[PDB]
Coordinates of C-alpha atoms in Angstrom, one line a residue:
Chain A
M1 CA 19.2 -15.4 -12.5
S2 CA 18.8 -11.6 -12.1
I3 CA 15.2 -12.0 -12.3
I4 CA 14.7 -13.6 -8.7
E5 CA 17.0 -10.7 -7.3
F6 CA 15.1 -7.8 -8.8
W7 CA 11.8 -9.6 -7.4
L8 CA 13.4 -9.1 -3.8
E9 CA 14.0 -5.8 -4.5
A10 CA 10.8 -5.0 -6.4
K11 CA 8.6 -7.0 -3.5
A12 CA 10.6 -4.9 -0.8
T13 CA 10.1 -1.5 -2.8
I14 CA 6.3 -2.6 -3.1
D15 CA 5.8 -3.0 0.8
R16 CA 7.3 0.7 1.0
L17 CA 4.7 1.9 -1.3
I18 CA 2.0 0.3 0.7
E19 CA 3.1 2.1 3.9
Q20 CA 3.9 5.4 1.8
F21 CA 0.0 5.0 1.0
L22 CA -1.6 3.3 3.9
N23 CA 0.0 6.0 6.6
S24 CA -0.8 8.7 4.2
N25 CA -4.3 8.3 4.6
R26 CA -6.9 11.1 5.6
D27 CA -9.3 8.2 6.6
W28 CA -7.8 6.9 10.0
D29 CA -10.1 4.1 10.3
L30 CA -9.8 2.1 6.9
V31 CA -6.0 1.8 7.6
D32 CA -6.1 -1.3 10.2
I33 CA -8.3 -3.6 8.1
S34 CA -6.7 -2.8 5.0
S35 CA -3.1 -3.3 6.2
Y36 CA -4.2 -6.7 7.1
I37 CA -5.6 -7.7 3.5
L38 CA -2.5 -6.1 2.1
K39 CA 0.1 -7.5 4.2
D40 CA 2.7 -10.5 3.5
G41 CA 2.2 -11.0 -0.2
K42 CA 5.1 -12.0 -2.6
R43 CA 4.2 -8.9 -4.9
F44 CA 4.6 -11.2 -8.0
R45 CA 2.6 -9.2 -10.4
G46 CA 3.6 -5.9 -9.2
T47 CA 7.3 -7.0 -10.0
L48 CA 6.6 -8.1 -13.6
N49 CA 5.0 -4.9 -14.4
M50 CA 8.0 -3.0 -12.5
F51 CA 10.1 -5.6 -15.2
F52 CA 8.5 -4.9 -18.3
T53 CA 8.5 -1.3 -17.7
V54 CA 12.3 -1.3 -17.1
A55 CA 12.8 -4.0 -20.1
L56 CA 11.0 -1.3 -22.5
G57 CA 13.0 1.7 -21.3
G58 CA 11.0 3.3 -18.6
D59 CA 12.3 4.4 -15.4
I60 CA 10.9 1.9 -12.4
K61 CA 10.1 5.5 -11.0
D62 CA 7.5 5.2 -13.7
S63 CA 6.0 1.8 -12.3
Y64 CA 5.6 2.4 -8.5
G65 CA 2.4 3.7 -9.6
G66 CA 0.8 1.0 -11.1
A67 CA 2.8 -1.7 -9.6
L68 CA 0.9 -0.5 -6.3
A69 CA -2.7 -0.2 -7.9
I70 CA -2.0 -3.9 -9.1
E71 CA -1.0 -5.2 -5.6
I72 CA -4.0 -3.4 -4.1
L73 CA -6.3 -5.1 -6.6
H74 CA -4.4 -8.6 -6.3
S75 CA -4.9 -8.5 -2.5
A76 CA -8.4 -7.4 -2.6
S77 CA -9.3 -10.4 -4.8
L78 CA -7.9 -12.8 -2.7
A79 CA -9.5 -11.8 0.2
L80 CA -12.7 -12.0 -1.4
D81 CA -11.9 -15.7 -2.9
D82 CA -11.4 -16.7 0.7
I83 CA -14.8 -15.4 1.6
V84 CA -16.2 -17.4 -1.6
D85 CA -14.2 -20.7 -1.2
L86 CA -14.6 -20.4 2.8
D87 CA -11.1 -20.4 3.4
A88 CA -9.4 -19.2 6.7
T89 CA -5.6 -19.3 6.0
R90 CA -4.8 -16.7 3.5
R91 CA -1.1 -15.8 3.7
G92 CA -0.4 -18.5 5.8
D93 CA -2.6 -16.7 8.4
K94 CA -6.1 -16.2 9.5
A95 CA -8.1 -14.8 6.5
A96 CA -9.6 -11.5 6.7
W97 CA -13.1 -12.5 7.3
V98 CA -12.2 -14.9 9.6
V99 CA -11.4 -12.0 11.8
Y100 CA -13.5 -8.5 10.7
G101 CA -16.3 -10.7 9.3
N102 CA -17.8 -11.0 6.2
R103 CA -18.9 -7.4 5.7
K104 CA -16.1 -5.4 6.8
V105 CA -13.4 -7.2 4.3
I106 CA -15.9 -7.0 1.8
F107 CA -16.7 -3.0 2.5
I108 CA -12.8 -2.5 2.5
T109 CA -12.6 -4.3 -0.6
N110 CA -15.5 -2.0 -2.3
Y111 CA -13.3 0.9 -1.2
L112 CA -9.8 -0.6 -2.3
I113 CA -10.8 -1.1 -5.9
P114 CA -11.9 2.5 -7.1
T115 CA -9.1 3.6 -4.9
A116 CA -6.9 1.6 -7.1
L117 CA -8.6 2.9 -9.8
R118 CA -8.2 6.5 -9.2
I119 CA -4.0 5.7 -8.3
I120 CA -3.9 4.3 -12.0
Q121 CA -5.5 7.2 -13.9
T122 CA -3.9 9.6 -11.6
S123 CA -0.4 8.3 -13.0
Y124 CA -1.1 7.0 -16.5
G125 CA -4.1 8.9 -17.9
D126 CA -7.9 8.0 -18.6
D127 CA -7.0 5.5 -21.5
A128 CA -5.0 3.6 -18.5
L129 CA -8.1 3.7 -16.6
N130 CA -10.8 2.7 -19.0
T131 CA -8.3 -0.4 -19.9
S132 CA -8.3 -1.0 -16.1
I133 CA -11.9 -0.9 -15.7
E134 CA -12.5 -3.2 -19.0
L135 CA -10.2 -5.8 -17.3
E136 CA -12.0 -5.3 -14.1
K137 CA -14.9 -6.2 -15.1
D138 CA -13.4 -9.3 -16.9
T139 CA -12.4 -10.3 -13.5
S140 CA -15.8 -10.0 -12.2
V141 CA -17.2 -12.4 -14.7
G142 CA -14.2 -14.7 -14.4
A143 CA -15.0 -15.0 -10.8
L144 CA -18.6 -16.1 -11.3
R145 CA -17.6 -18.7 -14.3
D146 CA -14.8 -20.0 -11.5
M147 CA -17.5 -20.7 -9.2
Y148 CA -20.5 -22.0 -11.0
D149 CA -20.4 -21.9 -14.7
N150 CA -17.1 -24.0 -14.8
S151 CA -16.9 -24.6 -18.6
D152 CA -14.6 -23.5 -21.2
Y153 CA -11.4 -23.7 -18.8
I154 CA -9.1 -21.8 -20.6
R155 CA -11.5 -19.1 -21.2
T156 CA -12.4 -19.2 -17.7
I157 CA -8.8 -19.0 -15.9
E158 CA -8.0 -16.1 -18.7
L159 CA -10.8 -14.2 -17.1
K160 CA -10.4 -14.7 -13.6
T161 CA -6.6 -14.9 -13.3
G162 CA -5.0 -13.9 -16.4
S163 CA -6.8 -10.3 -16.4
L164 CA -5.0 -8.9 -13.5
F165 CA -1.7 -10.3 -15.3
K166 CA -2.8 -8.3 -18.5
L167 CA -3.1 -5.2 -16.4
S168 CA 0.1 -5.9 -15.3
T169 CA 1.8 -6.0 -18.6
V170 CA -0.3 -3.5 -20.0
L171 CA 0.6 -0.8 -17.6
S172 CA 4.0 -1.4 -18.4
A173 CA 3.5 -0.1 -21.7
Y174 CA 2.2 2.9 -20.6
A175 CA 4.5 3.3 -17.7
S176 CA 7.4 2.9 -20.3
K177 CA 6.1 5.6 -22.6
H178 CA 5.6 2.6 -25.2
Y179 CA 1.8 2.9 -25.6
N180 CA 2.4 1.4 -29.2
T181 CA 3.0 -2.1 -27.6
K182 CA -0.3 -2.0 -25.5
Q183 CA -2.2 -5.0 -27.6
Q184 CA 1.1 -6.8 -27.4
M185 CA 1.5 -6.6 -23.8
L186 CA -2.1 -7.4 -23.2
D187 CA -1.4 -11.0 -24.5
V188 CA 2.0 -11.2 -22.9
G189 CA -0.1 -10.8 -19.3
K190 CA -2.6 -13.4 -21.1
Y191 CA -0.2 -16.2 -21.7
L192 CA 1.8 -15.6 -18.6
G193 CA -1.7 -15.6 -16.8
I194 CA -3.0 -18.6 -18.2
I195 CA 0.2 -20.4 -17.7
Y196 CA 0.4 -19.0 -14.0
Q197 CA -3.4 -20.6 -13.3
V198 CA -2.8 -23.8 -15.0
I199 CA 0.2 -24.6 -12.9
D200 CA -1.3 -23.6 -10.0
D201 CA -4.3 -26.1 -10.2
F202 CA -1.8 -29.1 -11.5
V203 CA -0.3 -28.2 -7.5
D204 CA -3.8 -28.1 -6.2
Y205 CA -4.1 -31.9 -7.3
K206 CA -0.8 -32.8 -6.0
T207 CA -0.7 -31.1 -2.6
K208 CA -4.2 -30.9 -1.6
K209 CA -7.1 -33.6 -1.7
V210 CA -9.3 -33.9 -4.4
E211 CA -12.6 -33.4 -2.2
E212 CA -10.9 -30.2 -1.3
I213 CA -10.4 -28.6 -5.0
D214 CA -12.6 -25.8 -5.6
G215 CA -12.8 -23.5 -8.6
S216 CA -12.3 -24.1 -12.1
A217 CA -9.7 -26.6 -11.0
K218 CA -12.5 -28.9 -11.1
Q219 CA -12.8 -29.1 -14.8
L220 CA -9.3 -30.4 -14.8
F221 CA -10.7 -33.8 -12.7
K222 CA -11.6 -35.3 -16.2
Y223 CA -7.7 -35.8 -16.9
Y224 CA -6.6 -36.3 -13.4
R225 CA -8.8 -39.1 -12.7
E226 CA -7.3 -40.8 -15.7
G227 CA -4.1 -40.3 -14.7
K228 CA -3.4 -38.0 -17.7
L229 CA -3.5 -34.6 -16.0
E230 CA 0.3 -33.8 -15.9
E231 CA 0.0 -34.8 -19.5
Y232 CA -2.8 -32.2 -20.2
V233 CA -1.1 -29.6 -18.2
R234 CA 2.4 -29.9 -20.0
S235 CA 0.6 -29.5 -23.1
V236 CA -1.0 -26.2 -22.2
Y237 CA 1.9 -25.0 -20.8
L238 CA 3.8 -25.6 -23.9
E239 CA 1.1 -24.2 -26.2
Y240 CA 1.1 -20.7 -24.2
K241 CA 4.9 -20.8 -23.9
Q242 CA 5.4 -21.1 -27.7
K243 CA 3.0 -18.2 -28.3
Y244 CA 4.7 -16.2 -25.4
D245 CA 8.4 -17.0 -26.9
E246 CA 6.9 -15.9 -30.3
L247 CA 5.2 -12.6 -29.2
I248 CA 8.4 -11.6 -27.7
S249 CA 10.1 -11.4 -30.9
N250 CA 7.8 -9.1 -32.1
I251 CA 8.3 -6.8 -29.2
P252 CA 10.8 -4.3 -28.8
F253 CA 12.5 -5.3 -25.5
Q254 CA 16.0 -3.9 -24.8
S255 CA 18.5 -6.8 -25.9
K256 CA 19.9 -6.5 -21.9
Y257 CA 16.9 -8.4 -20.9
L258 CA 16.0 -10.4 -23.6
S259 CA 17.4 -13.6 -22.4
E260 CA 15.7 -13.1 -19.1
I261 CA 12.1 -12.5 -20.5
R262 CA 12.0 -15.8 -22.1
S263 CA 12.4 -17.4 -19.1
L264 CA 9.7 -15.5 -17.3
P265 CA 7.4 -18.2 -17.6
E266 CA 9.9 -21.0 -16.8
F267 CA 10.6 -19.0 -13.8
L268 CA 7.0 -18.3 -12.8
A269 CA 6.0 -21.9 -13.2
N270 CA 8.4 -23.4 -11.2
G271 CA 8.0 -20.7 -8.3
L272 CA 4.7 -22.6 -7.9
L273 CA 6.2 -26.2 -8.2
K274 CA 8.5 -25.6 -5.1
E275 CA 5.6 -26.0 -2.9
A276 CA 6.4 -29.6 -3.4
Chain B
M1 CA -45.0 18.4 -17.3
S2 CA -46.2 18.4 -13.7
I3 CA -43.7 16.4 -11.1
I4 CA -46.1 14.2 -10.1
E5 CA -46.8 13.4 -13.8
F6 CA -43.3 13.1 -14.9
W7 CA -42.1 10.5 -12.5
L8 CA -44.8 7.9 -13.8
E9 CA -43.5 8.2 -17.5
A10 CA -39.7 8.3 -16.6
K11 CA -40.2 5.4 -13.9
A12 CA -42.1 3.4 -16.5
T13 CA -39.1 4.0 -19.1
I14 CA -36.7 3.0 -16.7
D15 CA -38.5 -0.3 -16.1
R16 CA -38.0 -1.0 -19.7
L17 CA -34.4 0.3 -19.8
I18 CA -33.9 -2.3 -16.7
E19 CA -35.9 -5.0 -19.0
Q20 CA -33.9 -4.6 -22.1
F21 CA -30.5 -4.6 -20.0
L22 CA -31.4 -7.7 -17.9
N23 CA -32.2 -9.7 -21.1
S24 CA -28.7 -8.6 -22.0
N25 CA -27.4 -10.3 -18.8
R26 CA -29.3 -13.5 -19.0
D27 CA -25.5 -15.0 -18.3
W28 CA -25.7 -13.6 -14.8
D29 CA -29.3 -15.2 -14.0
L30 CA -27.0 -17.7 -12.1
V31 CA -26.8 -15.3 -9.0
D32 CA -30.5 -14.0 -9.8
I33 CA -29.3 -10.7 -11.0
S34 CA -32.7 -9.4 -11.6
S35 CA -33.6 -10.2 -8.3
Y36 CA -31.1 -7.5 -7.0
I37 CA -31.7 -4.6 -9.6
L38 CA -35.7 -5.4 -9.7
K39 CA -35.4 -4.9 -5.8
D40 CA -36.5 -1.3 -5.1
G41 CA -38.8 -0.8 -8.1
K42 CA -39.5 3.2 -7.0
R43 CA -36.4 4.4 -9.3
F44 CA -36.5 7.7 -7.3
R45 CA -32.7 8.3 -7.8
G46 CA -32.8 7.7 -11.4
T47 CA -36.0 10.1 -11.7
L48 CA -34.4 12.7 -10.5
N49 CA -31.6 12.5 -13.0
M50 CA -33.8 12.0 -16.0
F51 CA -35.6 15.2 -14.3
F52 CA -33.1 17.7 -14.2
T53 CA -31.8 16.6 -17.7
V54 CA -34.8 18.5 -19.5
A55 CA -34.9 21.0 -16.7
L56 CA -31.8 22.3 -18.1
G57 CA -32.8 22.2 -21.7
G58 CA -31.1 18.6 -22.2
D59 CA -33.0 15.7 -24.3
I60 CA -34.9 13.3 -22.2
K61 CA -33.0 10.5 -24.2
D62 CA -29.4 11.9 -23.2
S63 CA -30.1 10.9 -19.8
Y64 CA -31.1 7.4 -20.5
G65 CA -27.9 5.9 -19.9
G66 CA -27.4 7.8 -16.8
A67 CA -30.4 6.7 -15.2
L68 CA -29.5 3.2 -15.7
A69 CA -26.2 3.5 -14.4
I70 CA -27.7 5.2 -11.2
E71 CA -30.2 2.7 -10.6
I72 CA -27.7 -0.4 -11.1
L73 CA -25.5 1.4 -8.6
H74 CA -28.0 1.6 -6.4
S75 CA -28.9 -1.8 -6.5
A76 CA -25.3 -2.7 -6.2
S77 CA -25.1 -1.1 -2.8
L78 CA -28.7 -2.6 -1.6
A79 CA -27.4 -5.8 -2.2
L80 CA -24.6 -5.2 -0.1
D81 CA -27.2 -5.3 2.8
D82 CA -28.0 -8.9 2.5
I83 CA -24.3 -10.1 3.4
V84 CA -24.1 -12.4 6.3
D85 CA -21.2 -13.5 8.3
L86 CA -21.1 -16.7 10.0
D87 CA -21.9 -15.8 13.6
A88 CA -20.0 -17.1 16.9
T89 CA -20.9 -20.4 19.0
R90 CA -23.2 -21.1 15.9
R91 CA -22.2 -21.7 12.3
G92 CA -21.6 -25.0 10.3
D93 CA -18.8 -26.8 8.1
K94 CA -20.5 -27.2 4.7
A95 CA -23.9 -26.5 6.1
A96 CA -25.2 -23.4 4.4
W97 CA -27.4 -21.3 2.0
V98 CA -25.5 -18.2 3.8
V99 CA -22.7 -19.4 1.5
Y100 CA -24.7 -18.9 -1.7
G101 CA -26.2 -15.7 -0.4
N102 CA -22.7 -14.3 0.3
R103 CA -21.4 -15.6 -3.0
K104 CA -24.3 -14.2 -5.1
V105 CA -23.9 -10.6 -3.6
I106 CA -20.0 -10.7 -4.0
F107 CA -20.3 -11.8 -7.6
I108 CA -23.1 -9.8 -8.7
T109 CA -21.8 -6.6 -7.0
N110 CA -18.2 -6.6 -8.6
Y111 CA -20.1 -6.8 -11.7
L112 CA -22.6 -4.2 -11.4
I113 CA -20.3 -1.4 -10.5
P114 CA -17.9 -1.7 -13.3
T115 CA -20.6 -2.1 -15.8
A116 CA -22.3 0.8 -14.8
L117 CA -19.2 3.1 -14.8
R118 CA -18.8 2.1 -18.6
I119 CA -22.5 3.1 -19.0
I120 CA -21.5 6.5 -17.8
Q121 CA -18.2 6.8 -19.6
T122 CA -19.6 5.6 -22.6
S123 CA -22.4 8.1 -22.7
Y124 CA -20.8 11.2 -20.8
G125 CA -17.1 10.6 -21.3
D126 CA -14.3 10.5 -19.1
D127 CA -14.9 13.7 -17.2
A128 CA -18.1 11.9 -15.8
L129 CA -16.2 8.7 -15.2
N130 CA -13.5 10.1 -12.7
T131 CA -16.3 11.7 -11.0
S132 CA -18.1 8.7 -10.8
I133 CA -15.4 6.4 -9.8
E134 CA -14.8 9.3 -7.0
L135 CA -18.4 9.3 -5.9
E136 CA -18.3 5.4 -5.7
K137 CA -15.1 5.4 -3.3
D138 CA -17.4 7.9 -1.0
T139 CA -20.6 5.5 -1.2
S140 CA -18.1 2.5 0.0
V141 CA -16.6 4.8 2.8
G142 CA -20.2 5.9 3.8
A143 CA -20.8 2.1 4.8
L144 CA -17.6 1.3 6.9
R145 CA -18.5 4.2 8.7
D146 CA -22.4 3.3 8.9
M147 CA -21.2 0.5 11.0
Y148 CA -18.9 1.7 13.8
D149 CA -16.1 4.8 13.5
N150 CA -17.7 7.1 16.1
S151 CA -18.1 9.7 13.2
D152 CA -20.6 12.0 13.6
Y153 CA -24.4 11.9 11.5
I154 CA -22.6 14.5 9.3
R155 CA -19.7 13.0 7.4
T156 CA -21.9 10.0 7.2
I157 CA -25.3 10.7 5.8
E158 CA -23.6 12.4 3.3
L159 CA -21.1 9.6 2.1
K160 CA -23.8 6.9 2.4
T161 CA -26.9 7.9 0.6
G162 CA -25.4 11.4 -0.7
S163 CA -22.7 10.2 -3.1
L164 CA -25.3 8.7 -5.2
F165 CA -27.9 11.3 -5.5
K166 CA -24.8 13.8 -6.1
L167 CA -24.2 11.3 -9.2
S168 CA -27.7 11.5 -10.5
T169 CA -27.7 15.6 -10.6
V170 CA -24.3 15.8 -12.0
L171 CA -24.7 13.4 -14.6
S172 CA -27.6 15.7 -15.4
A173 CA -25.3 18.4 -16.5
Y174 CA -23.4 16.3 -18.6
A175 CA -26.7 14.9 -20.5
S176 CA -27.7 18.7 -20.9
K177 CA -24.0 19.4 -22.2
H178 CA -24.1 22.0 -19.3
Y179 CA -20.7 21.8 -18.3
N180 CA -20.8 24.9 -16.1
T181 CA -23.1 23.4 -13.6
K182 CA -20.7 20.6 -12.9
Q183 CA -19.7 21.7 -9.3
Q184 CA -22.8 23.4 -9.0
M185 CA -25.4 20.5 -9.7
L186 CA -23.0 18.2 -7.5
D187 CA -24.3 20.4 -4.4
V188 CA -28.1 20.5 -5.7
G189 CA -27.8 16.6 -5.0
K190 CA -25.9 16.4 -2.0
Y191 CA -28.9 18.2 -0.3
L192 CA -31.8 16.1 -2.1
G193 CA -29.7 13.2 -0.5
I194 CA -29.2 13.9 3.0
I195 CA -32.8 14.8 2.9
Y196 CA -33.7 11.3 1.6
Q197 CA -31.6 9.5 4.2
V198 CA -32.6 11.7 7.3
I199 CA -36.3 11.2 6.6
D200 CA -35.9 7.3 6.0
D201 CA -34.5 7.2 9.8
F202 CA -37.7 9.2 10.8
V203 CA -39.7 6.3 9.2
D204 CA -37.5 3.5 11.0
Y205 CA -38.6 4.7 14.4
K206 CA -42.2 5.3 13.4
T207 CA -42.6 2.1 11.4
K208 CA -40.0 0.1 13.1
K209 CA -38.9 -1.0 16.7
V210 CA -36.7 1.6 17.8
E211 CA -34.6 -1.7 19.1
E212 CA -34.2 -2.6 15.4
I213 CA -32.5 0.2 13.6
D214 CA -28.9 -0.3 12.8
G215 CA -26.7 2.0 10.6
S216 CA -27.8 5.7 11.1
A217 CA -28.9 5.0 14.8
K218 CA -25.5 5.0 16.1
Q219 CA -25.6 8.4 16.6
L220 CA -29.6 8.7 16.3
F221 CA -30.7 8.8 20.0
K222 CA -29.3 11.8 21.7
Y223 CA -32.4 13.7 20.3
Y224 CA -35.1 11.2 20.7
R225 CA -34.3 11.6 24.5
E226 CA -33.9 15.0 25.2
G227 CA -36.9 16.2 22.9
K228 CA -35.8 16.6 19.3
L229 CA -37.6 13.5 18.2
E230 CA -39.8 15.2 15.6
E231 CA -38.1 18.4 15.9
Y232 CA -34.4 17.6 14.9
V233 CA -35.8 16.1 11.6
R234 CA -37.0 19.4 11.0
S235 CA -34.2 21.5 11.9
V236 CA -32.1 20.1 9.2
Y237 CA -34.8 20.0 6.6
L238 CA -36.0 23.5 6.6
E239 CA -32.1 24.2 6.5
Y240 CA -31.2 21.9 3.7
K241 CA -34.7 23.0 2.2
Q242 CA -33.8 26.6 2.1
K243 CA -30.3 25.9 1.1
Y244 CA -31.5 23.8 -1.8
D245 CA -33.7 27.0 -3.3
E246 CA -31.0 29.2 -1.9
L247 CA -28.8 27.5 -5.0
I248 CA -31.6 26.5 -7.1
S249 CA -32.5 30.1 -7.7
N250 CA -29.0 30.7 -9.0
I251 CA -28.8 27.9 -11.6
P252 CA -29.8 28.1 -15.1
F253 CA -32.8 26.3 -15.3
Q254 CA -35.9 26.6 -17.9
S255 CA -39.4 28.2 -17.2
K256 CA -41.6 25.1 -17.3
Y257 CA -39.3 23.2 -15.2
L258 CA -38.6 25.9 -12.5
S259 CA -41.2 26.1 -9.6
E260 CA -41.6 22.5 -9.6
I261 CA -37.6 22.1 -9.2
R262 CA -38.1 24.3 -6.1
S263 CA -41.2 22.0 -4.7
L264 CA -39.3 18.7 -5.2
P265 CA -37.5 18.1 -1.7
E266 CA -40.9 17.2 -0.6
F267 CA -41.3 14.2 -3.0
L268 CA -38.3 12.2 -1.5
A269 CA -39.8 13.1 1.9
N270 CA -43.6 12.7 1.2
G271 CA -43.1 9.6 -0.8
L272 CA -41.3 7.9 1.8
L273 CA -43.5 9.4 4.7
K274 CA -46.6 7.6 3.3
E275 CA -46.0 4.7 5.5
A276 CA -47.7 5.6 9.2

């Protein structure tokens, strides 16, 4: 529908923001490496942010700020993910570390983060910041579990992947001047995030070798080995699709995008399955 | 009372603080968290903060939280120095203890940072947060430049080791509820910091092989050859030493904790010169 269209523009607008930010940097040294970690992304979380802000009654103008902080955090987490799982093929190209090394990439990351935070509070306020720092710590926990404490699959993928979704959605609540839907929008992101990561893992089993499945996806092996994976995944997706279809009824979204938000997961899910 | 005395009481207390903290983080023993925190047990940076607190009339306990944040923030950065990147011509697919080390650091690092920030915000409010977030970005930049950026020793020894001391002092203001000393104390730390780092390098040449000094040595050479070996180390000292008293004289401090404050830059010089 219009959703994909919006995404094409949002994505395009988002890249513009990265330039208006990168080129505009007193630090004419951190620009090269960053440009690398930051490029070629589909900017999915940022457009969802931009989407909800509009669907809430705000002006996209008010999203440009968080939408950028988000992809900077998302991109940053991706380059680290490669360092951790030892992948050299991020964005269908040589991973960051595989070029500047393990240090540079990391250091840049330890800089992109606090920058992202400033950007958020600078345009939303301290409450926004603190919420961001709370989600940021969740991600840091999730990442550890995603690697070692692989147990309680749902709680783990909520923490590693769902967190930045919640950031993406919750920010639309500040951005749209509807802070009243805060707690509610934190959940939208939870359900969308979970839904996103459960399918992403499902696509790992179907397009990757089992011996090549890292992360919390491993915990799903107990379903896959028995040929009941699709069954488990499907169930999950439905569970959190219903919680989602419900939550949206108690959330004051503009009628115009009502019938477009219902398919957000439906859209988001397939978007991954296309790689098959 | 006496400087030498206080340190041995704030340090032991900081150790109990870390002890009760680490206990509340057994979950992170997976990446041997206590290994990176219990590293540098001198707790110098945290002692200063705890010091100025009473020096300004603030309660000793109202600094506790701030002390911890600092040390944790310090450990977090120290840990960064254990990162190892797979060298050229010699690596190994699936052959590494180096991947565990890297993972450990990346994980534990991204957790310490936001964790400390929250301690700062929970104890001193958002005023201290935005500053901390800001001082963090600097400590971050202070590393990409510690590598190779052709930057002068000036805009590097300030960012690298400076940002932390600045945080120590400034938080001592929030602890003593003396807001006016905000921008004030911020500088009284930048000076104790530049010292602590410029002196550490002195120990890198007199206690370590000149061929084994990476970091500040990028520019530290034009002196040891001309003649400013032990000369230049003093040029900046007396400069930033008097510039320290030059400002400490005009800062609302108490009586008992006044002269001692003056004769303090030595501690962070002598205690780090007790090598050879």
